[PDB]
Each structure stands twice: as C-alpha cells, then as structure tokens.
Design a binder for this molecule. Structure first.
Ligand SMILES: *[C@@H]1O[C@H](CO)[C@@H](O[C@@H]2O[C@H](CO)[C@@H](O[C@@H]3O[C@H](CO)[C@@H](O)[C@H](O)[C@@H]3O)[C@H](O)[C@H]2NC(C)=O)[C@H](O)[C@H]1NC(C)=O
Ligand SMILES: *[C@@H]1O[C@H](CO)[C@@H](O[C@@H]2O[C@H](CO)[C@@H](O[C@@H]3O[C@H](CO)[C@@H](O)[C@H](O)[C@@H]3O)[C@H](O)[C@H]2NC(C)=O)[C@H](O)[C@H]1NC(C)=O
Ligand SMILES: *[C@@H]1O[C@H](CO)[C@@H](O[C@@H]2O[C@H](CO)[C@@H](O[C@@H]3O[C@H](CO)[C@@H](O)[C@H](O)[C@@H]3O)[C@H](O)[C@H]2NC(C)=O)[C@H](O)[C@H]1NC(C)=O
Ligand SMILES: CC(=O)N[C@@H]1[C@@H](O)[C@H](O)[C@@H](CO)O[C@H]1O
Ligand SMILES: CC(=O)N[C@@H]1[C@@H](O)[C@H](O)[C@@H](CO)O[C@H]1O
Ligand SMILES: CC(=O)N[C@@H]1[C@@H](O)[C@H](O)[C@@H](CO)O[C@H]1O
Ligand SMILES: CC(=O)N[C@@H]1[C@@H](O)[C@H](O)[C@@H](CO)O[C@H]1O
Ligand SMILES: CC(=O)N[C@@H]1[C@@H](O)[C@H](O)[C@@H](CO)O[C@H]1O
Ligand SMILES: CC(=O)N[C@@H]1[C@@H](O)[C@H](O)[C@@H](CO)O[C@H]1O
Ligand SMILES: *[C@@H]1O[C@H](CO)[C@@H](O)[C@H](O)[C@H]1NC(C)=O
Ligand SMILES: *[C@@H]1O[C@H](CO)[C@@H](O)[C@H](O)[C@H]1NC(C)=O
Ligand SMILES: *[C@@H]1O[C@H](CO)[C@@H](O)[C@H](O)[C@H]1NC(C)=O
Ligand SMILES: *[C@@H]1O[C@H](CO)[C@@H](O)[C@H](O)[C@H]1NC(C)=O
Ligand SMILES: *[C@@H]1O[C@H](CO)[C@@H](O)[C@H](O)[C@H]1NC(C)=O
Ligand SMILES: *[C@@H]1O[C@H](CO)[C@@H](O)[C@H](O)[C@H]1NC(C)=O
Ligand SMILES: *[C@@H]1O[C@H](CO)[C@@H](O)[C@H](O)[C@H]1NC(C)=O
Ligand SMILES: *[C@@H]1O[C@H](CO)[C@@H](O)[C@H](O)[C@H]1NC(C)=O
Ligand SMILES: *[C@@H]1O[C@H](CO)[C@@H](O)[C@H](O)[C@H]1NC(C)=O
Lengths: 320, 175, 175, 320, 175, 320
C-alpha cells in the first residue's frame, strides 16, 4: 500500500585526499594531479633543433677552438652545454662573458662570412703550440693573430662597411704579453692599443703586460671583445699593436633560440618541454622538476603534488 | 558542503553504483532496486570537466630567459637575478595552492548542490503523495509498483492519478 | 547555479519585464498580470554594484620605471630587464583572468540565490493555502482576486483569512 | 475558486557571453568590459606637464647641442623623445648613456647654474664646424673646450665646493683625438688625463687616440661623464690635457618626472594616463594598449577583453 | 548570504547566548527557554578554524636578498632593483586583499548555510506535527512540554507519537 | 495545546566591520587581524647571531681600519650597520662597493688566514698618519703597503696556490698618488701597474695620479679590489709599482648570513623576524612594518589592516 524511494549518490572503497579552503585533507571520490614531478631523463630531439655542444662551450665553438671546428656555421633552437666541455687553445678571457654567451645563444647561429680585410705591413696567421691544429701550432679559426713585419708594426687603420640589411657581429681581441720583451718582440711598440668603432660606438683597449699563471705552456693571455654593426654603419679598426683581428662577421638573428647547461642524453622523441633534467610532458599546468625550462612548459612551483578534485566528497557505506 | 545533502541528511554513499553519480533506491510491492539518474550525473560531470579544461589549458612558451644557476660569486647583479626568480617562484606557488583550494571547495559544494537539486525536483513531483523521512527518502503513501517508480525516475509521474489514495493514507488510517 | 532556480525549476525568463529583475505573473478570477518585486531586484543589484566598485577601484600611479623596449642588443642586463616585465605581465594577466572567472561564477550563483529566496519567502506566506507546482508557480486553493494577489506581493497576505477555504479545496473536492 | 501565482525573472533577447569557473562561454543579461584596448592616438597636455623634445633627445638638450638651445632650463613631468630626433654637434658617446638619461629624466629639470670656474693657462671656448652655432663654429653650450695656451698645457687643478643644501649634477667629458699630431697640437702632452673627484668618489679617464668613422667631418670624439656633488662635499678637477670642462651644474630634484619614446601628437585635453600610443582612460582596471605607461593607469594584461557579468544568467523565452 | 537565513528569514540574532552560535528558543505549556545547539556551532567553528589555519600557516624564511633603500642616485641597475621590489609588493598586496575578500564572503555564506541546515534538520524531525511561520519559528500543533522540546533538540523526537493530535489540530478546529 | 519553537543564532552588541566581495564594510561577530603593523623597536639577539658593527661598516671591519680591529675574525647571521659608522684610515674607494659588501655579508665570516707572502726588494709595512694605530702611523691591518727599497722598485711576481678544499677571498688594492713626485718617491717607476690573476680570471689596474680633495690630510687614494681563488687554482700577483698587497685570505662560506642598515637597539629576547625597525612577531601572514626583513617573516603588504572574519554576520537585537 506504500513505497519508499531513497535518493543517493555513489561512493568508492578508497577515495583521494585533497585540500580545500576549510580542510587540509578531505576525501573525495576522484582527483587529478596538477604538478608534473618526474622527467624522462633524456632530452627529445623533437620538435626543437637541439645542438649538443659535446666538449665545446658555445664560446669555444664561436672562437674556433680547433676541437670545436665541427660546429662551424651551426644553428640551433637549443644549444646544450655539457659539463665535460673544455678549452684547448690559446688561454683567454671574455670581459662580460655572460653577455656574449647570451646574445650568441639567443641569435641561434654560428654562420660566419669571411671578409677581405687587408692587414698591410704585418705578418698574419700567427699560431701557438697552446692551440695546435693537427701536428703544429694553430689558433682560433675565426681570429687572425697579427705580428710585426720586420722592424715596425704600423698603425693599422682598416674599415669594413655594413652594406647589408642585417646586423653583423664582429668578434676580435687584444693580446696581453707576459713581459715587455714579448711585447716588443711581437709588436715593436712598447705599448699597443686597439680602438674599434662604428659611427655610434667606440672601444679602446690597452694591453696589460704581466705574468699570469701558466695555461697550456703560456702565461700571456687574449681578451675577447665584440662589436655589432647595424646596416649602413661602418666598422673601423685602428691599432699600432696587440690586435687579434677578426676574419669576418657572424650573422645575427632574432628568434626562439637559447642555451642550456645539461648532461642529459639526447633521445629521439618528441617533447615541447625541456629542462636540464630531461624533457617533461606539458599536459599538467605546473611542474616541480626544474625552474630552468625551454619551450611550452608547465609553470614551476615549489610543491611536488597538488590534487584537483574531479569528484564529490567520498562517503563510503556503513558496514552491515 | 553548503547544502548539507552529501555527508549531510544523506547518511552515506552507495558503493557499486557504476551507472551514475546520483540515483534512487526503492522498495515497493514488487521488491527493491537501484538506478542512476543520468541528468544530474551529467550536470555535475560537465561542470567538473569545464573546470578541469580551464585549469589544464594553454601552457605558455618561454625560450631565452635569464640564467638561474651560477658557478661563481658575483655580488649585485647575481643577487638581483636570484631575487627575481625566487620572487616569481613564490608568487606562482601561491597561485597554484590557492587555485586548488578554491576549486576543491567549489567542487564539493557543487556536487552537494546537484544532490540537493535532484532531491528537490523529486519532492516537487510527488506533491501530497509522499512525506519526507529526513534521510533522503520519501514515504510514498500509495501502492507504487516498478512502473510507478520508473515514472517518478523519468519525470512523467502524475501526482493526480494517486492523490486521493495518498491523502487517505496520509491524513488518516488512525486520524 | 547552486540553487537551481534560474535555468532550473524556473523554465525561462520573461522578456519585456522592465520594472524589475524578479517578479510575479498571476492568473486569477479577474484575469492575468505581471509585476516586478523591487526588494529582491535591489538586493541583487546592490551586490553586483558592490562587487563592481571593488574591481573598478583605485588604479595605482607609477611614474619613472624601467625601460621596456630596446634598440640595441646588450646581453645580461637587458635579459633581466625583459624577464622582469614579462614575469610581471604574466602574473597580472593570470590575476585578471582568475578574477573575472570567480566573480562571474559568483554573480550567477548570487542571482540564482535571490530568485530562490524570493520563492521561499512567498512559499512561507502562503502556508497551507497553496501547493507548489514544481515550475516556480503556486496553486492557491482559494479565490484570490487582484487585491489578494497584491497582498501576497506586498507581504501583507494573511493565510488565516483563507485557511478553511483552502484546506477544503486542497484535501477534498474528491477526497 | 483558485488562482495561480508564478515567480520569475527577466530575460533579454540578446545577452552577453562571459567566462566562469566551469564555463568558457555562458550567456548573461549584462556584462561590462574590464580591459581598456583603444587609445585616442594623442597625448593630453593635462594634467601632466608634457615636454615635447621635438628633434632633440633629452641628452642633446642637456649637453646644449645648438639646435636644442630652446630647452635650456626646461622642466617636465614627462619628456617625450621623438624618433625624428637627431644630433648636430661634435660627435660623442656617453659611457652608460641609459643611466645618465634615466637620472636626468627622473630629476625632471634642465636648470643650469653657471659657476665661475677659472681655467688658468689655457684658451677656452674652443669650437668646431661640426657644431656650428649660427654662421661659424660652436660647441655644446654647457661644456667648455679648453686647448693649450701657447707652448704648454698646464696641470689644471680647480675646485668648486657644494655650499648649498642640494645635490649638484656636473656633466663634463674628455676629448679622444684621432691622431697624435692632433693630441699635441691641442694639448701639447702626448697623453692627457682627467681626474674628477669629490671626497667620496673619484674618476680618472685617459683619452684614446685613433681614427673613428667620420661624423660631421670629424673622426675624433668626446666621451661624456657625470659627477653628483652632495651638500658639503667639494668638486675637484685635475687634468693636464683633454679636458672638456663643465660650465656649472644642473639642479637635481626628486619627483614624478620621467621620459617616454613616442611619436604621438600632443593634444589639449585631460588624461591621467599616458602610453606611447597616446592617452587612455583609466576607468577600467586593466588595459591592453601598451606595457609602457605613465600616471594613474589601468594594469597591463595580455588579454584584449575580459567581461564582468553585471546581470544574471540569460534564459530567453520559449517562442509560442 | 546565499541562503537567506541569517539576516534573512531570521530577523535578528540573540544577544547573551553564550553557550553556542546557533540555538532554539521555545514557548510551551511550562513556559519559555533558550538553548544552544552544539553540533551546528561546532561545524561552523571547525570550518572557520580550518580556514584560519591555512591562512596563518608557514611564513617563509628569506635571508640575504637585494638592497631596497639607496643613498646615492645610480641610474639603470637601481631603477631595476626598485621596480622589482615595487612589482613584488603590488602583487602581494593584491593577493592579501583578494584573499581576505573571498574568505569573508565565504565565511558569511558558510555560517548562513549552517543556520539553514539546522532549520531544515528540525523541519524534517517535526514532519506533519508543525507548520512553519516564516520567521525561523515552528508552530508545533500539539502539547509539547520541556521534555518534548528537549527531544526535538536532541534529535530523538518521534513524530508518530504525536501525529494524530497534531493533524486534528492542524487540519481542523474550524475546518 | 500547542508550542512554538524558534531557531536562531547569536549576536554581539558590538561587532567588527570586514570587507567582502560585495561589501566594503559589513559587520560580523568576530574578526582577526592579518597585517602586523607594529614593532618592538629593538632587535632580539635570539635566535640569529646578531653582530653590531657599532661605528664600523662591514667594509672597514674587513679592511682593518684601526677602530674596527675588534671585529677581526667575527662571524654573524646578521651584521648590523649603524648610521653612526665612520672611517678613520687611509682615504679609499672600492670600485663596485655594493658587490664586495654583499658577498662578504653573505659569506658571514671575517676569518682571516695570514699567508707567507715574500715581497723581495721592497720595504713593507708602510703607514700613514691618516691611519694612526695608537700613537703613530698605521694602515689597514689586512693590507701591506709596499714602497721602494732604495733606488728601485722591482717587478714583483708572487704566487700563492689554493691547496685547500675551499674558496679563498683575497682583498688587495692600488695606490693613486696625488703627484708624480709622490709616485717616483714611493715607487720609482713613473707609472706603476698591478695585475692579479688566477688561471681563469685576470685584472690589471693602472694608478691614476692627480689631486683629490683632502681627507685626513691626504689627497691621494687607495682603490680596493678582490679576487676569489677556487680550490686547485693559483693566485699570481705581478706589479712594478703601486701595489697595496694582501696579507692572506678570508675564508668564504655559504649560508643564511646577511647585512642590514638599522639604528635599532639590540635587546635580549627571541624573534625569528627582524626588520630595520626592530623585531616583529610572525604569527600573522602579512606585515606593513618594513619591506626589508631577515628571517621567518610575514609578507610585506601596503595595507595596514586586513581583518579576517572569524564569525558570522552580526545582527543585533530589536530593542523592546
Ligand atoms: C712569475 O711568477 C709565475 C708564478 O710563479 C711564474 O710561473 C711559473 O713559470 C714556470 C716557468 O718559468 C712554470 O714552470 C713550468 O711548469 C710546467 C708545469 O709543471 C712544466 O711542464 C714546465 O716545464 C715549466 O717548468 C710554472 O708552472 C709557472 N707557475 C705558475 C703557477 O704559473 C712565472 O714564470 C714568473 N715569471 C717571471 C718572468 O719570473
Ligand atoms: C683611417 O681609416 C678611416 C676609415 O677608412 C679613414 O676615414 C675616412 O677618411 C676620409 C678623409 O681622409 C673621409 O673622406 C671624407 O669623406 C666625406 C664624405 O664622403 C667627404 O665629404 C670629405 O671630403 C672626405 O673625402 C672618409 O669619409 C672616411 N671614411 C670613414 C668610413 O670614416 C681615415 O681617414 C683613416 N685615417 C688615417 C689617418 O689614415
Ligand atoms: C689641487 O687643488 C686642491 C683643491 O683645491 C688642493 O687641495 C687643498 O690643498 C690644501 C693644502 O695644499 C689643503 O689645505 C689644508 O687644509 C686643511 C683643512 O682646513 C688644513 O688643516 C691644512 O693645514 C691645510 O691648510 C686644502 O684643504 C685642500 N682643499 C681641498 C678642497 O681639498 C690641492 O692642494 C691642489 N694641489 C696642488 C698640487 O696644487
Ligand atoms: C667563405 C665563403 O664561402 N663565403 C661566401 C659568403 O661571402 C657568402 O655570403 C655565403 C652565402 O652562402 O657563401 C659563401
Ligand atoms: C575512475 C575515474 O572516474 N577516473 C577519472 C578519469 O577517467 C579522468 O581522466 C580524471 C580527470 O577528470 O578523473 C577521474
Ligand atoms: C647665469 C645666471 O643668471 N645665474 C644666476 C644663478 O647663479 C642663480 O642661482 C639663479 C637663480 O634663479 O639666477 C641667475
Ligand atoms: C542595460 C543595462 O542594464 N546596462 C547596465 C549599465 O547601465 C551599467 O552601467 C553596467 C554596469 O553595471 O551594467 C549594465
Ligand atoms: C695567524 C695564524 O695564527 N694562522 C693560523 C692559520 O694558518 C690556521 O689556518 C688557523 C686555523 O685556526 O690557526 C692559526
Ligand atoms: C570573543 C571571541 O570569540 N574571540 C575569538 C578569539 O578567541 C579567537 O582567538 C579569534 C580567532 O579565531 O576569533 C575570535
Ligand atoms: C659558412 O656559411 C656561410 C654562408 O653560407 C659561407 O659563406 C661559408 O662558406 C660557410 N663556411 C663553412 C666552413 O661552412
Ligand atoms: C632536477 O635537477 C635538479 C638539479 O639539476 C635536482 O635538484 C632535482 O632533484 C632534479 N629533479 C628531478 C625530478 O630529476
Ligand atoms: C516513464 O516510465 C513509464 C512507466 O515505466 C514508461 O511507460 C514511459 O515510457 C517512461 N517515459 C519516458 C519519457 O521514458
Ligand atoms: C498590500 O495590498 C493591499 C491590497 O491590495 C493594500 O490595501 C495594502 O495597502 C498593501 N500594503 C502595503 C504595505 O502596501
Ligand atoms: C637658467 O635658470 C637659472 C635659475 O633661475 C638661472 O641662473 C639662469 O640665468 C637661467 N639661464 C637661462 C639661459 O635661462
Ligand atoms: C600600441 O603600440 C604598440 C607598439 O608601439 C603596438 O604594437 C600596439 O598595437 C598599439 N596598440 C594600440 C591599441 O594602438
Ligand atoms: C533527549 O531528551 C529526552 C527527554 O528530555 C531524554 O530522556 C533523552 O535522554 C534525550 N536523549 C539524548 C540522546 O540525550
Ligand atoms: C683568526 O682566525 C684564524 C682561524 O682560526 C687564525 O688563523 C688567526 O690566528 C685568527 N686571528 C685573530 C686575530 O684572531
Ligand atoms: C619603519 O621604518 C620606516 C623607515 O625606516 C618608516 O617609514 C616606518 O614608518 C616604520 N614603521 C614602523 C611600524 O615603525
């Protein structure tokens, strides 16, 4: 004569705990993880053009350290610097190394165009046993070591116009002898100087004589500088000694290129997101793998887990 | 939750109900049974899906940024570089935490709401033919076999057809 | 919304009602009519206005800042300058998006709530003199002319005056 | 014998779609835009004191490039640099140009107070045809080009105390000749030097000889430096050659002043907010016009539209 | 709030009730009285405490950072250092403000919800033995002394025991 | 025959106003303050190791200004610089002072290890009446002023290997004479030079002659530099004049140490959080005392009050 109709909802034997506004842990039927916390341990060669530096830093590949000759004219989306990288050429320093490395990494190309510089009155192509190329002495491939021709080192004054529609990056340097004897032996002048300028910029460098610690048999050094010449501008190099001349320019580009420090293997696969730990999927909005990323990546958070409830409050049955 | 249905007037859930999230269990002249309500299930599911799609949407691409690990001590510029990233990480970590908390609170209230809306909808169909027991169940004061039960479930229940039997049973029998 | 009134038990809205946001439509001995309820309308409006005034409040003044566009490539300092602004823009863009989503969800639930509170308030005035049809309408079991209807609308309805007529109509006529 | 009373709410024939927590698009009766995405295209001269640089950069107006003489002693809330600006004086460079431009833009005044420096043993007021002032040769108005008086250029050693209650900004420079002949012709000494110091700071600059590219007929250059002297401190200038002396100091102020790059017209109107695109209203909390702003401005966001629901869910009528 | 109980159908609060947040006041054969309901009080309190503990949790430690006050004018690096901190302060100030607003809105709705859940729970216990007056009060249609009242309060009220007396009083006396 | 049962809630005679989504001010029964806005005005010596610099800056204590001799070998979690600090030794400058101060403050120790440098052919331990140590002339305790031994100042060339497993910080400097007479009198050479290098880095400094303003009777100056030598690297110092030699190295550490500018008293108490205004409790999540903090601190916000409702909406009684 009567009936009973009860309304209800489902429950699962084991739900998941989630945080809420009023609760640190409350059980729900289902939840989903929002923080990516694991990596494959390998870097996928797809879809970004990955360039393994192997035992070359981007700077050594740029200068032309003999063992980095293989990177001549390379391009990349992500240049990967290995910790095993080392230098094996003339001992040098780059005042403001981070900026040079940054702007080159960002440009994304090592394309070098040789230009016909004329260095009149000097002997070119100097080399060192600290930078052997094959059997004998060599030097960085993109630089030209000029020494005195006989009894005088003249006041070099050359120009190279940027008649193109793009920016030219010129890398050049100055030689710091370890003694005055070396200074006069190579450059005659007791004190050299290099002035590199465009119509808007100008840089004058004076060599610093002195003994530095021995590196590859040498106590002298080379300091690297750079000059970007915009279309229509002109490059002028003036010097009466110590000039480590450029052989041409690197083409500059703007794009998505960068550089990363990582010893992770490069594997054949596809992944939008790269961290030094290896690639990681980007299906989740956050990640806790590494704050250093490249590509379409989840945002870095300090948490290793953040569950989003995708079900109702779990209230299991009575029991009998 | 805000409505007090789930984990409220409804004692506990039903394990094993796989056909839906919300449903009915009945006891009538012909016996007992359980059935999922698909409309309310779908409503809760669509809201949770909509919520999930906004959250797991569009990771933004960053390419060349700033350095975040240093091998040498430098001072001023490096302190700034580190402070900037730490500041950024703290703010996003805060965003992630708050987001999850809000969302979860909302998910629980929303599902509790759908349980309640189904209950209310059912109450309104029954009119004066049933009384509420206070536990998510209704006492239907008239013979209601399986077809009758299914008509309540499918929303085609006509209270008029049973009004007089129900009223006599409700407001009488003893007085 | 959470209450299931708007776009819930109330089928659809009424176009052309310009005197308010919520209202009544009746059918009685004298005919039909529609009227806006000003109290509930004002409550929803004041909450939306209060919400709007907090959001469109106090733009902060910034004068000299950092450069944000560069003509030359510089390296380190410029990367930092750009990262800082990009980081800032991403966090504010996130704030703007979340703010709008929360607010809108709330606005819809709040207006749905006011529809429900007006419905409940009306239910309570009628006592045993009416039954709920399940569609936002009440069947008032007694002759209720336009003055009677207006007394319900203005909240001066005295259920006692009609109780006996209503009860006889409700619990009888057939049985 | 009975009546029907239905409760309801309004609807509009056409509502607006808005985003919610669970919905990307849901129709409401009304909404309001929160993102300002259009500009007038003009910069309102009210309420901020706008100063149009015209064809002068703030630096050229500061140095006194003859064509920027009109800005002498100007003040501003916002100095506006036009892309059409150009230099027409002696070719120069400002090592750390961004900082000099920044601190001057921020100070907000070009008020110059001439001080009675005595440059004994030198010929003052040198000029150049690269910097013509009217018919003949000129030079920057705020700088004093000193050359040798006869057979010697003495060791200049002057002092100027800050006996005021404010900071003095001194702008000075050094001349880089293009050849040694020019160096000795003007300064006698084969190598000059300029040391500028206060009790707390000190700067020594050595000129760099060398040919730079030709600008306005010249291959030599001037490099600009600055020194801020705090109340009670003293300025001391020491040099035996190549000094481009200051003629006094600029008053420094702290305030809301700044500088902006924009080619947008200045119109007579009133607007709290300025972007390079032109002024924009600030009634909305966010804007998508430009990340570069000045004044009471909406916050910059990447979105071009964000609607705030100002009405309920729109549910239009049946139809029959 | 969303439920319309507090500052809604319930006119005002009761000052001096120190034993709880929610309660009952009765008038029966033996007189009047007031009592706190501990279960609903505790529910609201636990939620507010849980909310408070998440907010006043884990201050993070920072040691060496960046300089934030400068004695000399420097230009570029200093502008950046200042912009970074100002940007940070604005974003956290925004976080603090939004957090408080959300939370407070929620606290008010949650307490309003608990008032309503207690009301509904009481309604369901009484079944056909009482009618709702529209002001948070019930008219119990049968003699209900202090023990009867306490049984309603402690949830052991058996509506059956009084059904026939209540029904006669409700649906009759006059008609 | 009937009874009345009313449901209700409590109210208080005076509630607190709080902000909500739809309300700027709404009264609730109770609320709690989230913004810490007061300080004790004193800095608690617990739990962080506080080091009061008194009248010494961290740099003067590092160089060994005679009046800062008391800080020799000190360590700290927080070094506190007082505004009353002053210098009383040879007038000097530290090019990139902020970095030196930062890295030392951060290292957290002044532990100095004297090393056996041999300065052959020079007279060591020079002093000045500008830096009196007791009755007569002194100099910074951690620096060694070398002058010529007779008729010549030789080319100093010393080395000191880092055979330890930690980084060594070396502080050294160069002397800028005020005249050439002083230059030759002390160093013989008309122009000195100091080159300090490791295998990776190198720095060459040339002194700048010229009169600077008088400080403690002197117009000459000393400029301070630093070099960090990593384990396995070697320090080489080369100079033929103007060298202000190091006497050893400072041990470097990594940790929670820092430095703060504050004139607030140090009191005996315990407090995780320190601001220049004094310690503040960290029970509240936000604070409005100072943006400069150290330790476990509430986050800085611009607001001075933010109340969190800890009760329901307050609706007081009728009145009769
Ligand atoms: C100035 O002082 C530096 C630092 O002490 C001197 O450098 C040292 O120079 C000698 C050669 O004169 C180097 O010896 C070489 O060592 C290698 C490696 O063991 C060995 O294979 C060679 O046959 C040779 O013996 C020594 O390594 C080097 N030490 C350092 C730390 O660089 C420099 O010679 C001095 N210069 C003058 C002009 O006095
Ligand atoms: C060092 O090399 C530079 C760069 O090549 C030389 O600069 C050039 O100098 C000549 C004058 O000697 C400039 O010629 C002038 O050109 C202008 C513009 O067309 C013309 O109106 C003048 O009548 C004159 O002919 C030439 O423009 C300039 N080139 C550049 C790129 O600056 C410089 O002369 C050399 N210096 C020495 C001492 O050899
Ligand atoms: C180059 O110009 C500077 C700046 O004018 C000269 O400095 C001044 O030098 C004199 C000493 O020759 C200082 O006098 C001393 O003053 C103190 C303090 O009153 C007093 O106690 C001493 O007995 C002595 O008279 C004077 O203070 C100082 N002025 C400044 C601003 O530093 C410097 O002498 C000139 N150098 C040459 C080589 O001409
Ligand atoms: C060394 C050499 O081969 N140089 C030329 C270079 O000038 C030209 O721009 C390039 C373009 O591919 O082709 C090649
Ligand atoms: C057992 C179950 O329901 N699992 C679901 C899963 O299929 C879904 O992908 C996830 C996100 O919505 O939520 C949960
Ligand atoms: C060149 C000149 O006129 N200088 C004076 C200046 O020294 C004084 O400070 C100024 C104040 O208005 O008045 C004028
Ligand atoms: C047709 C209509 O109602 N328009 C209103 C408009 O007047 C108001 O300014 C805006 C913001 O509240 O919301 C909407
Ligand atoms: C000047 C002096 O006393 N030096 C030694 C120092 O070489 C050693 O490293 C130190 C360790 O406590 O003990 C002492
Ligand atoms: C009178 C009263 O209830 N005061 C309470 C207080 O004890 C509590 O510490 C604070 C935070 O919940 O809220 C309020
Ligand atoms: C590098 O690429 C440029 C551009 O094609 C070309 O001029 C040059 O010959 C290339 N050199 C090498 C070594 O590939
Ligand atoms: C990623 O690498 C960092 C350091 O490179 C390490 O601390 C962290 O644990 C790694 N995380 C994972 C998931 O491998
Ligand atoms: C509802 O149930 C009845 C009885 O079982 C059935 O005949 C009818 O077809 C159902 N209606 C719908 C719309 O499914
Ligand atoms: C309510 O309606 C009645 C009947 O139409 C009218 O007489 C009365 O004045 C109204 N009350 C109020 C408060 O407006
Ligand atoms: C610049 O203003 C200052 C201060 O009034 C005054 O000394 C000087 O004469 C003014 N010079 C010009 C060119 O207006
Ligand atoms: C504002 O200017 C920027 C570049 O200056 C341009 O990309 C953007 O489209 C402009 N926006 C508007 C609304 O004019
Ligand atoms: C409820 O009230 C009744 C009557 O006052 C009392 O006898 C009974 O023990 C109470 N029940 C509980 C569980 O406290
Ligand atoms: C400084 O501490 C080091 C390490 O213990 C020690 O070599 C040296 O003797 C100490 N010097 C002083 C002055 O305490
Ligand atoms: C803290 O110090 C700053 C400046 O050092 C001052 O502006 C602020 O008012 C102080 N606040 C308190 C609470 O003492």
């Amino acid at each position: 004569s009567t009936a009973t109709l009860c309304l209800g909802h489902h429950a699962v034997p084991n739900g998941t705990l989630v945080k809420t506004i009023t609760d640190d842990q409350i059980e729900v039927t289902n939840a989903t993880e929002l923080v990516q916390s694991s990596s494959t341990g390998k870097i996928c060669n797809n879809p970004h053009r990955i360039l393994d530096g192997i035992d070359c830093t981007l700077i050594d590949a740029l200068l032309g350290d003999p063992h980095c000759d293989v990177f001549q004219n390379e391009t990349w989306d992500l240049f990967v610097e290995r910790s095993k990288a080392f230098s094996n050429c003339y001992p040098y320093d780059v005042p403001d190394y981070a900026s040079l490395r940054s702007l080159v990494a960002s440009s994304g190309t090592l394309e070098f165009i040789t230009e016909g510089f004329t260095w009149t009155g000097v002997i070119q192509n100097g080399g060192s046993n600290a930078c052997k190329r094959g059997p004998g002495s060599g030097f960085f491939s993109r630089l030209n070591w000029l020494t005195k021709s006989g009894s005088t080192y003249p006041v070099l004054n050359v120009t190279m116009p940027n008649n193109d529609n793009f920016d030219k990056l010129y890398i050049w340097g100055i030689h710091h002898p370890s003694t005055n004897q070396e200074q006069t032996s190579l450059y005659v002048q007791a004190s050299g100087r290099v002035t590199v300028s465009t119509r808007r910029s100008q840089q004058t460098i004076i060599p610093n004589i002195g003994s530095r610690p021995w590196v590859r048999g040498l106590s002298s050094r080379i300091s690297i500088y750079w000059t970007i010449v915009k279309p229509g501008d002109v490059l002028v190099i003036n010097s009466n000694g110590n000039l480590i001349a450029p052989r041409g320019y690197f083409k500059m580009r703007t794009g998505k290129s960068s550089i990363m420090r990582s010893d992770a293997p490069i594997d054949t696969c596809i992944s939008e997101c790269i961290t030094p730990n290896g690639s990681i999927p980007n299906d989740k909005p956050f990640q806790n793998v590494n704050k250093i990323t490249y590509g379409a990546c989840p945002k870095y958070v300090k948490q290793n887990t953040l569950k989003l409830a995708t079900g109702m409050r779990n209230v299991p049955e009575k029991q009998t | 939750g805000l409505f007090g249905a789930i984990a409220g007037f409804i004692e506990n859930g039903w394990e094993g109900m796989i056909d839906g999230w919300y449903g009915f269990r009945h006891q009538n002249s012909e016996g007992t049974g359980q059935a999922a309500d698909l409309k309310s299930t779908q409503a809760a599911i669509d809201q949770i899906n909509g919520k999930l799609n906004r959250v797991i949407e569009k990771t933004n691409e960053k390419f060349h940024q700033i350095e975040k690990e240093f091998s040498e001590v430098e001072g001023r510029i490096q302190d700034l570089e580190k402070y900037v990233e730490d500041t950024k990480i703290d703010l996003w970590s805060y965003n992630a935490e708050l987001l999850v908390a809000l969302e979860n609170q909302h998910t629980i209230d929303l599902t509790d709401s759908e349980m309640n809306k189904l209950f209310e909808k059912t109450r309104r169909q029954l009119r004066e033919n049933a009384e509420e027991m206070g536990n998510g169940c209704f006492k239907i004061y008239h013979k209601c076999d399986n077809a009758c039960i299914e008509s309540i479930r499918n929303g085609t229940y006509d209270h008029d057809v049973y009004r007089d039997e129900a009223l006599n049973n409700r407001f009488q029998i003893k007085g």
